[PDB]
Structures are given as C-alpha cells and as structure tokens.
Structure 1
Amino acid sequence: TVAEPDRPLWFPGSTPPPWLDGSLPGDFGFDPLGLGSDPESLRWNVQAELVHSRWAMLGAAGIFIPEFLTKLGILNTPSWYTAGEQEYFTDTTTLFIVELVFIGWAEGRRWADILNPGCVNTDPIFPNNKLTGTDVGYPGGLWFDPLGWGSASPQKLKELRTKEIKNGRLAMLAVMGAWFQHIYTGTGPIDNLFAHLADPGHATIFAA
C-alpha cells in the first residue's frame, strides 16, 4: 500500500472514506453506500470487482467486435442477444452441464486461494509447475503470464493494474448497456451507434 493522500477523487473537494486509502489499483474513493468498510469484505469485493471486470471485458469483446465485423460484411455471426438458442451440434443442456464441471473446477481452485492465499498454487498431477503470482486475483504463472509482461518491480505493475480495472469498469458498463439497448430497442449495438451518429440530435433514447 502506497497511501496516496491526494489522489484524484471521483467527487473533487470531498474527503474519501477511511477504509479507502488508495491501497487498491484504480482507487478514486467511490463508496457512498459504504459497502466495503470491513477489511475482509473489502478484500472479497476487490476479488469480485476484478473477476467481474475480466469476465465483462471478455464479453464486451465477444459482443461488440463480432457484430461490428458482421455489420460490415466479413462473416455472419447472428445477433448476440438471440445467439443463445441458434442450435449447435448438441443441445444447450449437455454443453452447459459439461462446461459447468469444467468451469466449476477452476472456480473451486479460485475459491481455495481467495480464502487461503497461496495454498493451491501448484499442480495435483505434476507438482513442479507452480503458478507464479503472489497476490490474490493476480495469479501469474506460465499459463496466465506466458509473456511475463508485468512481473517487473511494483511500480509499472501498479499503474498496469489500474489500467486493467479501468478498462474493466468500462466493459461492465458496456455489456450492461448492450443488454439494455437490445431490450429497449430491437436492434443491434452497432446499429444503434450508426443511427445515433447519423442523427445525434434526434436518434437517442428519447426516441420512443
């Protein structure tokens, strides 16, 4: 922790809460409801925000690029919203249950370490493989750090983590917006962007 006393705040001029001393990556003092005033709860919520932002970055990619790239005629991905029922080689239940066990084991490993830092790091079959990362939420390893892009002294890594969390907050809002836009209108996100850019003064949410 580098207790940035004068970090830029979300609400300039107002004092940040005491449990937010800037310790966490991208801390701007935003906790009006005080949902993280407990150290254990703070830790848990740090983990939650990180995993949410990572999932949501993966989702924002997988929604916005395929339809921005099939709006232009590159290939033919259907609408991300109704992309759930367009049938595949099997039924959704077999894939969902098969994936649940697959996704489940990894989730269990994360739970094993979130609740006990650094106790699951090594591999169950070949016990010489040893995931690298020494922080919870930042596991490293050859699997999650093959390039070692951010294994340098804790300076660039701290500004690298903020980068990740900011992109991730943006992605969470993005993904929720696409779902809300798809429920309110009946179009695609790139369609909405193109329309609002064709007529900004009139083609907005105040169009119904």
Structure 2
Amino acid sequence: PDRPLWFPGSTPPPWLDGSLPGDFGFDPLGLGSDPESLRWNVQAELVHSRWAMLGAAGIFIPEFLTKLGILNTPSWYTAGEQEYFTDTTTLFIVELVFIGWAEGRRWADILNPGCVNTDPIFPNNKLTGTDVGYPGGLWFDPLGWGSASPQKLKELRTKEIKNGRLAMLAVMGAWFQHIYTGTGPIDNLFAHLADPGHATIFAA
C-alpha cells in the first residue's frame, strides 16, 4: 500500500493495492482492472511462473553439464525432434490424458474454489490449501512450508512469482538466442564472458 513501485514517482493503478504477492503497480494497459480478470491473470501468472522455472532449470542445468562432460544431453532446442522409446506422438496422447486431468481439476478449483480438494477414489486423502493457486496437502506441500503467517506467505509467494517472472524472460531468451546465434545458452554466456564489449547481440 506504500510499497516500492515499478515506476518510482508514478501512481499505481487503483486495482493494485499491494495485497497480491509481487504487486509493484505494473499494469499500464489495464489488463487486470476488472477483478474477475485480475484473479484469472493471477492464476495464469502463477502457472506461467511454475512452468518457466521447471523449463529454465530443465534447459539451463542439463545444457550446462553437457557443455562440459558430466552429462551428454542433446541440445534443448532439438531434444524434441529426436526419437525415444515410443514415438513422440504417443507420448503426447499420454501427456494430454495425464496433464488434462490435472489441468481439469485445477480449472474446477479456479471456477469453484473448494470443489476438488478431496480424492475421488479414496476420499480420505485431502488437500490443505485455502487460496486458489496454492493447493497444499501432502502432494504439493508435504513439508507444511505453504502454511505460515500471512507476512511470511506474502514474501514466500513474492519469491515464488519473482523467480517465475525472471524464468519467463530467461526461457524466452533461450528460445531467441538459439535462433539468432546458432548454439546453446551456455555457449552464449561464455562468448559474452570471453569478450563482454563485442560478443553481444551485434554481429552486423
């Protein structure tokens, strides 16, 4: 409510208090001005953050070890085009039925916040989350680190969304660098570390 803003001296939009984690008053196009949309965009930002972080660590760490020798994992940009134990199109069907189910229940939870906290096969199992986007329970917060004081939950979720935002620019950078340069990300960083003033986005 008196927090640092993405634009010091500017005035934050009325729909952004500071009660949301990662609230820095940035929405110059009013994409979240309607409260119904702002709640949907929070959930969309949360899942974009969590997929980007898994994706970032899934392309930066494995490529970081193959550039050496600890791993031999192929280029992240081409790992999809190679063949596996079954064909790629069977893996995609198994992915949809498995991810669609998990996505379906998350969807139901967004539109009806308490309806899917109970295990449909063994109704003894239950999730523990109170807020949409933080399902809790044993399967997603087995340590109990998700249930804390609202002061710590504000920071912990701000750490969550900040790491997810950075990961989003990073993953999108890894996709763009691989097309403008011609190698992997670990190569780009060393090249820029070999000569910082010249080995950049300029080649001409």
Classify the TM-score, shorter chain: over 0.9
Structure 1 segment 77-92 matched on structure 2, within 5 A: 77-92=73-88
The whole-number CA distance in structure 1 between the counterparts of 2:134 and 2:53 is 16
The whole-number CA distance in structure 2 between the counterparts of 1:156 and 1:187 is 41
C-alpha deviation, 1:149, in angstroms: 1.6
The percentage of aligned residue pairs carrying the same residue is: 100
C-alpha deviation, 1:128, in angstroms: 1.1
| Partners of 1:130 and 1:141 within 8 A in 2 | yes
| Partners of 2:12 and 2:25 within 8 A in 1 | yes
SS at match of 1:105: helix
| Partners of 1:52 and 1:172 within 8 A in 2 | yes
C-alpha deviation, 1:49, in angstroms: 0.2
- Give the alignment's TM-score, normalised by structure 2: 0.98
C-alpha deviation, 1:74, in angstroms: 0.3
The whole-number CA distance in structure 1 between the counterparts of 2:93 and 2:121 is 24
C-alpha deviation, 1:179, in angstroms: 0.1
The whole-number CA distance in structure 2 between the counterparts of 1:85 and 1:108 is 28
The whole-number CA distance in structure 2 between the counterparts of 1:80 and 1:9 is 36
Gaps of 5+ in 1: none
Can you list the C-alpha shifts for 1:41-70, whole angstroms capped at 9, x where unaligned?
Answer: 000000000000000000000000001111
Gaps of 5+ in 2: none
Runs of 4+ off more than 4 Å: none
The aligned counterpart of 1:41 is: 37
| Partners of 2:13 and 2:25 within 8 A in 1 | yes
SS at match of 1:83: coil
**Alignment: residue pair count:** 204
The aligned counterpart of 1:75 is: 71
Can you list the C-alpha shifts for 1:91-130, whole angstroms capped at 9, x where unaligned?
Answer: 1110101111111000000011000111110001111111
Q: Supply the RMSD in Å over aligned alpha carbons.
A: 0.7
C-alpha deviation, 1:150, in angstroms: 2.9
